[PDB]
Amino acid sequence: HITILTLNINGLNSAIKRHRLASWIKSQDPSVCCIQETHLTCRDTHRLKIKGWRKIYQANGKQKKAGVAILVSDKTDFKPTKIKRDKEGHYIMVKGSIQQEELTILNIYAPNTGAPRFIKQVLSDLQRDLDSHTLIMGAFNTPLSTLDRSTRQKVNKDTQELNSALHQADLIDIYRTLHPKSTEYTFFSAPHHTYSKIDHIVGSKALLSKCKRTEIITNKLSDHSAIKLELR
DNA sequence: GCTCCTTTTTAAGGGCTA
DNA sequence: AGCCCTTAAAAAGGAGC
């Protein structure tokens, strides 16, 4: 087994913060790490350098906003076959073979204003590469179930609009499926003293066979928590 | 270099018109 | 049913030592 990690880092333009991210990731030791909200521009990708993770695939915009990265451990032979990247910086997709078992990874950062519905259209734009071995991860900035929110408000209609799009592509929320009754959160809103789980691991139903654990990890690096997934 | 203050950015209720 | 303005606290920016 292989480990997948998701973290909304909330800005990486500080050099001290890049150092702390480097040390945290070596601490966690994932096989693949997905970072959202790096805030690195198109010409600033080489500032992001972790030792032990030399394959670092990025999609960036032109402003110190958005930005996604997929980091691949040096301890796994990951031989990539396709790389599609938005040049606004909101998603990157990587297909390859970790431990020679095929896999697709889509790393998405949805803007909070109109989030679930940017995600629906992103799935439709990358339709033709979506498989039976996908993981979708990142800052969805939307809850998917009423359990993803401390106010427990009923779900947006357009989240039911995405849940259909996930279910018609045979994808499930991996975290919810392994903990259908669990309330643990990835974001605390200090202005409202609310909690929410707006960051997600979504995956092919077919790979649910292969998933052992999914953890929510506290950290001193960002105002979001991280999601860890050990596969098999 | 460095310290310290100012401005921007971001997720989310809570009120309320088309 | 969905938008606008506000909120707090960090990220990004900048004046001045």
Residue numbers in the entry: 7 to 238
Sentences copied from the publication:
The autonomous non-LTR retrotransposon long interspersed nuclear element-1 (LINE-1 or L1) is one the most abundant mobile elements in the human genome, comprising 17–20% of its content. ORF1p acts as a nucleic acid chaperone that binds L1 RNA, while ORF2p provides endonuclease (EN), reverse transcriptase (RT) and RNA-binding activities through three distinct functional domains. L1-EN initiates de novo L1 integration by producing a single-strand nick at a genomic site generally fitting the consensus target sequence 5′-TTTTT/AA-3′ (6,7,24,25). L1-EN belongs to the family of metal-dependent phosphohydrolases that includes apurinic/apyrimidinic endonuclease 1 (APE1) and DNase I, which are part of the exonuclease-endonuclease-phosphatase (EEP) domain superfamily.
The double mutant protein L1-EN-D145A/Y226K was readily crystallized in complex with two DNA substrates, dna14 and dna17, and structures were solved to a resolution of 2.8 Å. There is one DNA-protein complex in an asymmetric unit in crystals of L1-EN-D145A/Y226K with dna14 and two complexes in an asymmetric unit in crystals of the protein with dna17. Notably, the preferred scissile bond (TTTT/AA) was juxtaposed with the catalytic site in all three complexes despite differences in the lengths of the two DNA substrates and in the contacts formed between the DNA and symmetry-related molecules in the crystal lattice. Remarkably, the observed deviations in geometrical parameters were almost identical in all complexes of L1-EN with DNA for the middle part of the DNA substrates, particularly base pairs in positions –4 to + 4 relative to the scissile bond. In contrast, conformations of the base pairs at the ends of the DNA fragments were found to differ between different crystal forms, reflecting unique interactions with symmetry-related L1-EN molecules in the crystals.
